[PDB]
Subunit: 166 residues, 4 copies
């Protein structure tokens, strides 16, 4: 999704990550530019799976008012690295999805990277259990992002205004 | 997981494979020796996924009457190759799973292979919608297995006796 | 390293591809935009490998006259699909490299693709044993490139002018 | 190519591994049972690659005195992990090859593991720059292997007798 030079960094993930506590609704707060989000008001809904991992339901509002959504399935392929997921969205090739940091109740810092020779395509995201996230939490997560080569300057803020998104 | 010489054959899969028709209950009729089937009366149940692919519930009876079962998730990582799945069983590393041939309402030939240098570990299985499958059908699928270098003689026949399996 | 929408296409590869005839010097005639070519006069030289596959030496001229180069190794990881190689350059992650069409003594259409969810990163190339290639030959390879969704308008022409590259 | 239960362990590899100091001739001293060594007197010879990584030439003596050898190519696909190699032996699928420990001048502990569902296939070997290695060094390396579940009882000692190998 977003090309930067160098090979993919390998940042720390959430230690002892617990997926059952990660389920539910997360709101997109900030994110690296990508090719899949085409609007605003983005939310992810993660739910229990009857097999392994969990189901994914992403949803956003387009500027012309059209609502768009996708379904996918998330799986930790190595049970010993539960924070290192892979998402299989409908009609999409698999993408990595690592949870760098989360407190389950408020925020989460998500990272994703795929190698491209001497370059890489990266995606990063700050999400929240609410349409807003406190300013301090955001600055902290931006802080870790800098350590693995994401520029805070390059981030897009997602519109989560209550009126516009209903 | 059966070690044989040579690299994994790359047999053909079922053309224009339709997972919705592959769902439901399958009985293990014959199978390559493996490390996971520990008894008899083996069935697989495939169900809808709210994400992609489908949910898996494999189940067998032990000699002492104890029922053993596992849950997992099946996903075709390349949507243009829907018959070439990957199974993510709980407590297992991901494994390949090809539907080489199926008519959906009667039989299916499942193959799975993993390379080990100049050797490979293979798993193959004939399943049926009924606890039995006609011998001529069994013979035909055995033909297919031989055509890509599996020995029919090494196949194990699975117990599906209504008396024993009830 | 060029983003286009959709998953990677799988165009046909060169039949009975013979790497021994593909060795030697190729001149870049035109190619998709990428992050590795920074100048002109780009050439690829393919050489004997004492193990498997063959050796790679890429070379171009910078605008200030500085020559830049990389070495790498090409390996056909599956001997039965010899046209589907993996290229391992110094300081780079592995990249696919398919020889889609070549007559060995004149031209070659090179392709490479890596998936990015519902998008993909592509690189495509028309190379030649001479610094120029006939207009009729280029158009044919353009017909093929068009067939998997690269537009001739998106292509860059490589400077192979004898004076300037000298 | 030796099947054990559980997923592949992830042992530490030699820190700051230098492939350049690893070149030349190593003798097989002890090894896990595998499918490729058919005799004795086995040596691996590693040499410069004109591309990336290094060149591979393995050879052993068969019981009937006939000598057999293979060539391949070794590559660290992740340059930041030079001890984590991939070996491409001729006509074989790629295999992992980790250097867990080496002092370059005397010994080396090589490990390799490929997952097979809830089981795995492993290969490990203690090599030496001489046909023999001191018992204390061997014991030390056997110690390391034990910590990740290879049985010292399962190890085979390789015949490197000077006369028999002459
Ligand atoms: C997404 C896929 C992808 C591919 C395929 C790819 C090829 C590739 N070409 C490279 C160097 C190079 N490659 C070329 C040119 C060629 N390269 C060719 O495959 C051919 C046919 C030519 C034509 C001669 C040149 C000239 C260099 C060196 C340029 C320089 O470093 O200044 C490198 C080394 C890394 C770098 O210098 O940044 C890679 C990885 N990179 C990718 O990200
Ligand atoms: C390079 C890596 C990479 C990733 C990680 C990735 C995720 C991804 N997000 C998607 C949809 C979506 N994704 C989101 C939003 C999110 N998505 C998230 O992973 C998170 C955390 C949010 C935050 C809420 C939304 C709203 C959609 C639906 C978009 C639409 O239909 O327009 C899709 C589906 C494909 C599509 O319809 O275009 C993919 C593959 N794609 C990639 O190429
Ligand atoms: C599951 C992982 C796995 C590994 C790692 C592996 C290594 C491996 N060793 C091979 C040959 C060989 N390998 C060796 C010896 C060695 N090989 C070594 O990795 C080392 C350290 C030595 C020590 C000297 C020899 C002597 C041969 C040649 C066998 C012959 O031709 O008789 C081959 C070629 C296949 C063949 O033709 O038989 C492979 C794939 N195979 C696997 O399945
Ligand atoms: C290298 C290849 C390879 C494959 C394919 C594989 C499948 C596989 N089958 C499993 C359980 C199982 N698998 C089955 C039966 C089936 N399974 C089928 O794919 C089909 C068609 C049936 C027939 C109905 C059953 C009944 C179980 C549960 C067994 C138990 O509880 O012990 C498991 C779970 C973990 C384990 O017990 O090892 C795996 C990984 N394992 C491998 O190593
Ligand atoms: C907005 O855009 C989408 C895709 O471009 C389109 O399908 C949809 O109909 C548009 N909504 C309108 C015009 O209401
Ligand atoms: C049946 O078998 C398994 C092991 O084979 C054992 O764990 C289980 O307790 C047994 N149950 C009995 C004795 O019914
Ligand atoms: C050529 O230009 C590149 C641009 O970065 C630079 O790396 C290099 O120093 C230049 N060579 C010179 C100054 O001769
Ligand atoms: C020795 O035995 C091997 C098989 O065991 C055989 O292939 C080889 O040719 C034999 N060597 C000779 C010439 O006796």
């Amino acid at each position: 999704s977003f090309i930067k030079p160098g090979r993919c960094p390998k940042p720390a993930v959430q230690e002892d990550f617990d997926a059952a506590r990660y389920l539910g609704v997360w709101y997109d707060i900030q994110r690296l530019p990508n090719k899949f989000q085409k609007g605003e008001c983005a939310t992810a809904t993660y739910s229990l799976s009857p097999g392994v991992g969990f189901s994914v339901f992403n949803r956003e509002r387009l500027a012309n008012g059209t609502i768009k959504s996708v379904i996918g399935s998330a799986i930790a392929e190595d049970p010993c690295e539960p924070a290192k997921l892979q998402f299989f969205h409908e009609n999409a090739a698999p993408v990595p999805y690592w949870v760098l940091s989360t407190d389950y109740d408020n925020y989460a810092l998500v990272y994703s990277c795929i190698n491209l020779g001497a370059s890489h395509a990266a995606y990063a995201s700050i999400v929240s259990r609410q349409p807003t996230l406190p300013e301090e939490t955001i600055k902290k997560l931006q802080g870790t992002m800098s350590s693995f080569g994401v520029g805070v300057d390059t981030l897009l803020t997602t519109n989560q205004d209550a009126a516009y998104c209903s």
